[PDB]
Subunit: 212 residues, 4 copies
């Protein structure tokens, strides 16, 4: 009824009802998240779901290609809020196979504004150029890129003042490079989990585990 | 097994299996989203879910308090990508009752870095000061604030070059101010849906609909 | 000689020589700046000069229309660096009559990207709409706008965590709203100099001093 | 007289008078800048001066360490404004020997917020790690760093959509990596002047010209 998004308000009452086991109360009561999930705006599947947890149990940021810019106060804000105030136990940068962002980059594809944003990802391409070479294919490189991208981003988090300060001040925290396949639902561990400024080794290891 | 996040990889195989109706294929095949959802990092409930749609059918950005800064290339990027390249039909700023961001603001609460980010929301508080007055309570103001916040943010989207250009170039697009209760799952329409630079009227109307 | 910018390297040796009173040594020795100048990229006249001081005696940021965004880590960075580490005594937002930025705004003029940035200034226009009304002219409004713009920006600085923390921690600091005419070289005091969170009064006063 | 900055208003009338050759009129009449100068907030000496030109003849941005972030709408704004609307002929990233920013970086020195901003410069350190090695000294590395930093930043400008589009659309434009000594006033050419997407060669050359 000119509702514009009527369909959506219907699919909504539709949803609201299906949850008879009365508990939006459970949700509204949910307590502190213990995780920050930084992921891609290709919200192919939601975080809590993927990882099988109640919603809101995971604190979420999403930008195109799950990029952490040193100077992005959008994300930094999220992080300082998750760490300093929610005392989340774990931050994890989760990339996703077949990401439209990492694609558009890779194949120097003009998009307009966001080209600027994807430069960040082109940088990872540049950074790991030779490595990405010895995978002379397509999907390999791509896979390997969305992987590398997630590791670097993690380096970014770990270099933040927010995080370094938390470690400085004793607060337990660990930061994970992580990827998931939208194809197979499964979630891959890159062995990228820093906990104290031992990044130099933890990452070198993790990046070794490409070596074509 | 020192997995650090073993629990999470388990709850994962747990999830992966439960989806016997073999279709991660369906997902991987999912086509263009027709919606951009900008919401709060208090990811109390996921967008597609709330609104009853397959995941990835909705394109998502999340920052603390679903703020659209004129000059935030984090979000602007998402938007230029959603509009210009995904030709999404609808953008909608969705706030959420009992948002931790809108709270921390409201009650001038020091948090650290993100205080800077929440200033944006304090601004809406300032902007609609007298209005928010004639609700001399607490939860009212709060409710009314998370509402107003979502409208203003929409004004922000609608003022973007990205959007104005899309309209300029004929491309059909509509932008909605929207809120949902985590208490009752239900989703409220603020009557804030701009489609062509007719904001001045569409919003004045929408903001009228507080008038204590 | 294909130098591309030969002219500039010449006008340079030209400059280098004219400074016989050997003292680039004096400069290289110059000590801490005691001022942060935030001004417009319309660098109509340099700060130190205007204000008659040795160069480098003033620490400088320049963006289009001397805008301080709550979440601009470009400027915030400059400020945290000037205050926390250079212990500058004074920060001052200095606008400038006939500013091309404040103009382009004012007369809703499409420019492209920076339209987004100028929205910040349109906001001040919005914020002080009625005030700016009772100046039914052109240049008045403009004058009055570049003025108001500089005050608001100051409110922005004063609201920063950086500044609030400095005051919190006792460190003496004062923040000034200031304008200069490129026409007459002279520099106007807006009576906008906050020193401790007494903004609410100091600014109300300062903004009164328009009252058409 | 409690003026707070009386000294400054005096040194001002002092300046205003000394310019008897009546011409603030000349200035106010000055026409379009044909240059964008991006430099460091260590405003050791002003651009026009250094380069011997009337003020305002050069359009100026200043951030800590003259960093161009892919996603910094503060600077990008300046650039889109300088290029698209002022049709400046030349953009030039000008670093400066003994820069406090490049220093603080280099010697992983905690400063607070701006540490985040300087990460950008640490990145150049990382990027050119081995190169910077074969200069086993201090001031060498430093010199060589403030140099490299200015080249990379230029790569950043040249990768911008703004610039690429200008070239796309025929508009003549050239981008220069440039450094100046505050010690000796002199300005060094790094042979870094791109004019059309021929960066890959122009820069490789320019970076060769370190080779310890
Ligand atoms: Zn993606
Ligand atoms: Zn929220
Ligand atoms: Zn200006
Ligand atoms: Zn410097």
């Amino acid at each position: 009824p000119l509702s514009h998004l009527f369909d959506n308000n219907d699919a909504w009452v539709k949803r609201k009802l299906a949850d008879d086991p009365q508990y939006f109360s459970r949700l509204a009561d949910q307590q502190a998240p213990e995780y920050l999930w930084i992921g891609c705006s290709d919200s192919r599947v939601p975080a809590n779901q993927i990882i099988g947890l109640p919603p809101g149990e995971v604190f979420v940021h999403r930008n195109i290609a799950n990029v952490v810019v040193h100077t992005d106060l959008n994300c930094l804000s999220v992080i300082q809020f998750a760490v300093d105030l929610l005392k989340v136990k774990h931050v994890m940068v989760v990339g996703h196979y077949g990401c439209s962002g990492v694609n558009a980059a890779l194949h120097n594809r003009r998009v307009g504004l966001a080209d600027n944003w994807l430069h960040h990802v082109q940088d990872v391409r540049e950074k790991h150029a030779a490595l990405l070479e010895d995978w002379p294919l397509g999907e390999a490189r791509y896979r390997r890129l969305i992987e590398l991208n997630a590791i670097e981003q993690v380096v970014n988090v770990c270099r933040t003042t927010i995080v370094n300060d938390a470690w400085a001040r004793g607060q337990p925290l660990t930061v994970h490079a992580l990827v998931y396949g939208v194809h197979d639902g499964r979630m891959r561990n890159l062995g990228m989990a820093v906990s104290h400024a031992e990044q130099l080794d933890a990452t070198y290891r993790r990046a070794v585990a490409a070596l074509s």
